[PDB]
Symmetry: D2
Subunit: 171 residues, 4 copies
Amino acid sequence: MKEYTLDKAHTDVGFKIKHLQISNVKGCFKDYSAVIDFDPASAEFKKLDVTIKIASVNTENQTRDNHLQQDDFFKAKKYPDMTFTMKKYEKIDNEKGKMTGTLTIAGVSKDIVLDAEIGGVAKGKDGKEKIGFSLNGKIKRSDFKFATSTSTITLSDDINLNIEVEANEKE
Amino acid sequence: MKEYTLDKAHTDVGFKIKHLQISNVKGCFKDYSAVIDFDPASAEFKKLDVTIKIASVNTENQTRDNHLQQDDFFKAKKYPDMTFTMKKYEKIDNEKGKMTGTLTIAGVSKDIVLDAEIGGVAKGKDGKEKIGFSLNGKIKRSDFKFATSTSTITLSDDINLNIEVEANEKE
Amino acid sequence: MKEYTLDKAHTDVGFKIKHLQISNVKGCFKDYSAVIDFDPASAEFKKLDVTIKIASVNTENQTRDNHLQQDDFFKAKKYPDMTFTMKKYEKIDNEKGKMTGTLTIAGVSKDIVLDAEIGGVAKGKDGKEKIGFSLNGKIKRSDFKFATSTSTITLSDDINLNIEVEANEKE
Amino acid sequence: MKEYTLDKAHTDVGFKIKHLQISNVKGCFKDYSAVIDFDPASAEFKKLDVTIKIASVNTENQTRDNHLQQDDFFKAKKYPDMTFTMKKYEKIDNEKGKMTGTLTIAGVSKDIVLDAEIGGVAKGKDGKEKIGFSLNGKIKRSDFKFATSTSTITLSDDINLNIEVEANEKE
């Protein structure tokens, strides 16, 4: 038998334990087109049709962006774009309204409601019109059978849409 | 009615979605004492008694370290230290053995098994002995009623102990 | 050495593995009062004030119901009731409107929006009025600092309110 | 304007909220073979080779059992069986030892340690031998690239093996 004394310098009294952390993935699409018809006399939208290039997704992370293009997500080879078509604008007051439209993700289509908030109507520097509105709402992955392989535990069924638009008159 | 054109520069076609991520919290205790009796003739431990100062926890994050001291974790005011007392060493061969001891966390005591791996026995520079062994095993939070308020979902019931010792002879 | 043959009848080649499952807790309150003022000429609400007895919660499980009364949930001893006061009804059409009100949970108050859906206005059997409407919306635990000890991982931050009312005229 | 009174009988003041629950999936395999060589003079295993028919899995649920056979789990069409081959038994005492062997799941092979606990050696009714031992240990899905598509969040990386054997002498 013999007696020893730790050498605290080259000793580590260590442990490891696993925990979960919830976090928000934020994202936009860098490339999209839209047709916007709006009547500033009445603060009503008349037509709003958006097309978004799935390839232009950005979640400040190049490897996840790539992964979003694959079979378990968007399938951008087969379905390069997502589209929104307004079907109905129901005015609440001049600042607020309920927008109903058809969202299409990887060829699956559902009618959604977005909350229109008109944050400012103006005549610009040059005397031609501008507008600044937002569109906000929550869609469910499951309504669109989006990423069905991924559990609703790992990744939320709820996606929150925040569309922030500034926009100038035409021609 | 009027027609607008997005100003892509001050437009954000955005979304937010929540996901979970699993991660390992790694940690040690910076301050502890131990009594080590070991027989290099037979590669058997004779006595191993450790006392650890809960206050000296380190998980490379000062606010979590603090939080670990509180009622929902260690309760360092009431129970400043955790202790391990070897009760039995069962040799497998000269490199490996099964250690049984009594672990005490916030005044609750359970007998645990650690896997002893002797990574090297030597006479040092000066002709006085050294040893380098490891102690590894898994304990359950629930066996010790540790952090009972925290769910086994958020934070794993399993803690993995990795004790890495280098140690020199006495007097 | 000797050779054996399993007795499959008293042998179990077994395993255990842990998984998570997401599920909806559904609930109502069995006891509450309300004051309802509604104008069937215009399909507008004028006043809607609800008081709910937290003690009357029902989630088809007596031990959870009890637990909901405690410090980590409602604190029914200190705060026996939750209240909603309408502040604004904004008509969309005769079937739909946006209700804004003040919800109070354990003494914390936030303005919320509920989606009013009028599912049917009538003169009853006896020639006195009835109505059937629904109120739907999502509130965040965190907005009300409700159950702050419970993680948003274990239990969702989002609560979905589904108020389904049938109601007859007064006196 | 008009005043109404709830009809509590056809009113529901309701809510829905999502929570997670952890649970153990328990399972065995109903059909398997083994070769067992054991020396009761010394309480040492000499040979232990097991083959398990993946098709015979049982987790008291027919739809999960089926699902376990598919590409995202066992792939029973391509790999109908899992095998264990003992490579080393290291005696601790007559009741306990450390078994090292090669486990093969869907064609991937890893050396694992199981804790042998001999719960009883005997001469039977007829004067021919019996034994009752258990084999216990933890394996990681990831070590075998098992169910790689399923997250370690949803389903634990750790599987706990509990093999409970009773067994009679040969010929």
